[PDB]
Amino acid sequence: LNSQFMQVYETLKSELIHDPLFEFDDDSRQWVERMIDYTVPGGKMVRGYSVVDSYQLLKGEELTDDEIFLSSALGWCIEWLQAYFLVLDDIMDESHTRRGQPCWFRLPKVGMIAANDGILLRNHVPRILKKHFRGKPYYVDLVDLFNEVEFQTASGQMIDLITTLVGEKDLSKYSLSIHRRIVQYKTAYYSFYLPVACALLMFGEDLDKHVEVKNVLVEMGTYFQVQDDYLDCFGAPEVIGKIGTDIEDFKCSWLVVKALELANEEQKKTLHENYGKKDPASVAKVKEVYHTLNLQAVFEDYEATSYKKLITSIENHPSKAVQAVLKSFLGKIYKRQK
Amino acid sequence: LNSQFMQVYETLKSELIHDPLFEFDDDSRQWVERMIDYTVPGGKMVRGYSVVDSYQLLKGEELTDDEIFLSSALGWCIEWLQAYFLVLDDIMDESHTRRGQPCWFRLPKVGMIAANDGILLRNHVPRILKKHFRGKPYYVDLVDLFNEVEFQTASGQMIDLITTLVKDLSKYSLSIHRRIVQYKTAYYSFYLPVACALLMFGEDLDKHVEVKNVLVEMGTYFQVQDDYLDCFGAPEVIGKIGTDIEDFKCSWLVVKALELANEEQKKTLHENYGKKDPASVAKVKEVYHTLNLQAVFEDYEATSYKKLITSIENHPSKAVQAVLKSFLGKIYKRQK
């Protein structure tokens, strides 16, 4: 159902740039169409896809043309929402590239106009919801759902920024609790809960009755980001497709907060003196501390322990349909190498 | 009701920093509370308060404490929404001060974090709506209303940005100016507050396209007045020195000048519009004076007022006429 998913993108984009709520001309229609094409469909679309996959698993049989369109539409709302956050994040972080191209705000003719473009993208989400879902009994739930997850994501970004940018760098500002809070609100609600929540609402379910599903997905999304933190330092560049810079970038990574928790006082001193320095020798001393502390084994331990909990929680769920949704998510990330 | 209005702000801000949807701690609660106080309540609050006034005028009687709270809360949603756009506008335009203080993004401990704070402010609007209106039969209409007007406003800002920033004056035109002021300002400044009051009053907005058209027209007129005052208004009254000519703004003045200018006049405008040089700024104003744009604005004002007064007095509802006449009287022949 890939070609169709992409076809749904083309239809939604075409609808957006002929939106009756706004008086377009040639230049403004061109501006938005190009902005959408640049910022929205350039990724792997895993979150988007997941709506269609999860919905298929809920039904148990093949989808109608309408179910494929509707599930893909919600998938795209998620991708639109992510694109908006990423456009702004690139601005705040002074990034240079994303998805193999200059960041939107880096183009000569875009500049800080990118900030309002990101805002436009966010507003595209209710336009899509209104066009195709306004007659559904669960319309209000979808609208509330997207606002709430957007709120949680913004709040997660907020604590990430103030933890890692406000004031002096001070590695003691970092901790496991803060790391969890950041990862949970910033990524886990929109990446893992949102897709399944979309599928559930479309299936006719009541989210008030699926808190269990939400809690598992949040846990899973937390595990997912720990894996990412780990891979940034220990994954092979030939496999993960980048050279990690979390150490240089003074990131609140699971690795540094774990190391801080395990270190003695010379190691803690080494960390404080070398973490966040763009220097290859300082980076090496950090990685050396991680090796000495055996962080690989600690992570393998965490991963083994997290997997069993998730599996246990999933199997304990009364719905077999839900289990198949959850196990599919757990399966796409467990022991991944990128 | 002014004192109750500010009390509502305190209640709303308190709810927002104890929101069970987010896991606040002391640091993040202090961050958000300070950010709200800095960015939201520092203005004149005309738009926010106009929801309370409008609802009052619809009712034709004293308000209950609940009506005072609900209409203020909607008023504050509008001020929160505006505050979010202004935080972002300051960043994009690289401004230095606003409301008598450095722009939020200019503070050394804030910087570009201001961008995500603006986003947080936007997300506070549905938090407020849901907390206080979830059980109202017009809840979905409120949420849709705010989403729609946010969309229009961001689209208006979009054409404002691309018209001015991406260079010749020939691209400027009367219809582009209309589109900019309509979408960027008129819907959130004039329609939105009345739409809020109407929904609270039990009305169906599908039945009020006429109210919408009038308010959008009134908002367009408001912006033209604003463009006029930027160049011809008294700084001693306006409280600033206009720089629209320097800023290369698609002002109503410049597009009217272009509509009327000869080849000599047009070449001068093309030569000097958008120059910081006070010599070039004064060259533009002289053209404006030669074409008698004062009398042209005077004619547009008198014509606009008569049309608006006419549409208002045709309205089937005398309570709605009171709402509309109050907005008109708030802006007619204003000097700032």
From Swiss-Prot, chain A:
Its cofactor is Mg(2+); Mn(2+). GO terms for molecular function: (2E,6E)-farnesyl diphosphate synthase activity; dimethylallyltranstransferase activity; metal ion binding. A motif (DDXXD motif) lies at residues 89-93, 228-232. Keywords: Isoprene biosynthesis, Magnesium, Metal-binding, Transferase. The Asp-Asp-Xaa-Xaa-Asp/Glu (DDXXD/E) motif is important for the catalytic activity, presumably through binding to Mg(2+). GO terms for biological process: farnesyl diphosphate biosynthetic process; geranyl diphosphate biosynthetic process. Its EC number is 2.5.1.1, 2.5.1.10. Pathway: Isoprenoid biosynthesis; farnesyl diphosphate biosynthesis; farnesyl diphosphate from geranyl diphosphate and isopentenyl diphosphate: step 1/1; Isoprenoid biosynthesis; geranyl diphosphate biosynthesis; geranyl diphosphate from dimethylallyl diphosphate and isopentenyl diphosphate: step 1/1. Catalyzes the sequential condensation of isopentenyl pyrophosphate (IPP) with the allylic pyrophosphates, dimethylallyl pyrophosphate (DMAPP), and then with the resultant geranylpyrophosphate (GPP) to the ultimate product farnesyl pyrophosphate (FPP). Has a 4.5 time greater affinity for GPP versus DMAPP. It catalyses: isopentenyl diphosphate + (2E)-geranyl diphosphate = (2E,6E)-farnesyl diphosphate + diphosphate; isopentenyl diphosphate + dimethylallyl diphosphate = (2E)-geranyl diphosphate + diphosphate. Highly expressed in shoots. It is an enzyme of class 2 (transferase). GO terms for cellular component: cytoplasm. Isopentenyl diphosphate binds at Q82, R99. Belongs to the FPP/GGPP synthase family. Optimum pH is 6.5. Optimum temperature is 40 degrees Celsius. Binds Mg(2+) or Mn(2+). Maximal rates of activity with 1 to 4 mM Mg(2+) and only one third of activity with Mn(2+). No activity with Zn(2+) or Ca(2+). This is Farnesyl diphosphate synthase 1. Dimethylallyl diphosphate binds at R98, K186, T187, Q225, K242, K251. It comes from Artemisia spiciformis (Spiked big sagebrush). Mg(2+) 2 binds at D89, D93. Mg(2+) 1 binds at D89, D93.
UniProtKB/Swiss-Prot annotation, chain B:
Its cofactor is Mg(2+); Mn(2+). Mg(2+) 2 binds at D89, D93. It comes from the Eukaryota. Mg(2+) 1 binds at D89, D93. GO terms for molecular function: (2E,6E)-farnesyl diphosphate synthase activity; dimethylallyltranstransferase activity; metal ion binding. GO terms for biological process: farnesyl diphosphate biosynthetic process; geranyl diphosphate biosynthetic process. This is Farnesyl diphosphate synthase 1. The chain holds residues 73 to 346 of 346 of the full protein.
